[model samples]
Target: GELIQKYIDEILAEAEAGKKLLLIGAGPAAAKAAIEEAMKRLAETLEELLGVEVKVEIVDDGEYEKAAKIIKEADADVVVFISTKELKKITKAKLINILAADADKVAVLDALIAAARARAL
Candidate 1:
């Protein structure tokens, strides 16, 4: 939504433009296909908004380890993980956890604020 576009300016004001965003969907084997679609939708939406690059990856269940190194080395300013499970602690990059089943995309903006705020802290 425009909510993110509006706040995107203020949130990343200090940072450089054209930031990189990495999206990884980690969940069940059956859920992998759906997760990939969701990530694509989100990635396309955000990339269009920020002129940033968004990369989408799908990993098996609870396979944050599969993504750990990729996440750390992606040079991403923000990483969004679509899963039912939670990561104890993951990347140094700004992180967002969106439910595997969600109708409201606006929730991402809230996560971005806290991710940036927490990362800022």
Candidate 2:
């Protein structure tokens, strides 16, 4: 918990005051809904706490291939994958995967925010 807090602090400090983050998820309908719900809650809190914007884009299982193009086009600060399987489809240095299965959305958001900050630095 302390480590995660440290990461949050670093991310909040290093991130541009008004920059944005792009979050992408690809999976089944139920999985997509869960991911979207998680992101919706996290995005609000993150913007309030970190002064950064958070955008979410969820693709269907069939559209998984489009995620890579979306990631490239956005030049996202960091991409958060819903699963390791989806994450493996894209090859980007600034990515955080394997959090979709985890129930703790805050921790996942914290890690993604930290990675974005690290990429900026």
Candidate 3:
């Protein structure tokens, strides 16, 4: 569980330091629910650790195509997407374009590094 602890510490530290996160994802209803739950959990953890209110904006599944635009509009410090599916949507290049558009957004765990890099983070 060292990895889990390490991740928690890093995430919390970022939040404690006033980091803003923009969460993005696309999937089934259950997957979306899971993502929301995880965001809520992380928010709670961050608040507890930082003793301050942390901002967590969850972009819904339908917003995948415009994720980059959303992030740009929000001017978020980091972009963390939670999804059960791979970075490249099965048989589609739409996700790739979105990632490309938001290249600078920090992808917490993206399977598509090239796309992430294109975002220029």
Candidate 4:
């Protein structure tokens, strides 16, 4: 936890003051609501210390291209995505993909830090 905190501090500094986490996940309608709930819980964890912001966006089926457009324009802060398959149209080094079946929020949180820093990360 301490180590993660240190990393967060450094990345937030690197990002200046704007801290936004955009989560775009693809899933079924029933599971979609549950995943969105999970997203909010995960977001509150990030918002605890400072004014970090978050957005929970969803895509249906394999329409990653739709997700791509937002990221392409925004370029983004901490872009985390979840899909069963590989991306075809979206090409970005900053995007992190989480498993649709995974339950490890902690690891996901860590990856959000991984997304915040420079693209070389």
TM-score of each: 0.63, 0.59, 0.49, 0.59
lDDT of 3 by residue, 4-27 (tens): 344544444454454555545444
lDDT of each: 0.61, 0.58, 0.43, 0.58
Report how far off residue 92 is in candidate 1 (Å): 3.1
**Tens-place lDDT digits, model 2, residues 1-121:** 5655554554455334437677666656655576676666656656766677778887776565687777777755755455435444454435555443434544565565555445446
| Model 3: residue 9 alpha-carbon error in angstroms | 2.9
Model 4 lDDT tens row, 8-59: 4554553345567676676665566666666666555556544677677766
Off by over 4 Å in 2: 1-18, 86-93, 102-121
Cα TM-score of candidate 1: 0.63
The runs of at least 3 residues in candidate 1 whose Cα sits more than 4 Å from the true structure, single-residue gaps closed, are 1-18, 100-121
RMSD of each: 7.4, 6.0, 11.4, 6.9
* Top-down lDDT ranking: 1, 2, 4, 3
Return the top candidate by TM-score: 1
Error of 4 at 9 (Å): 13
At residue 89, what lDDT does model 3 achieve? Answer: 31
* TM-score-better candidate, 1 vs 4: 1
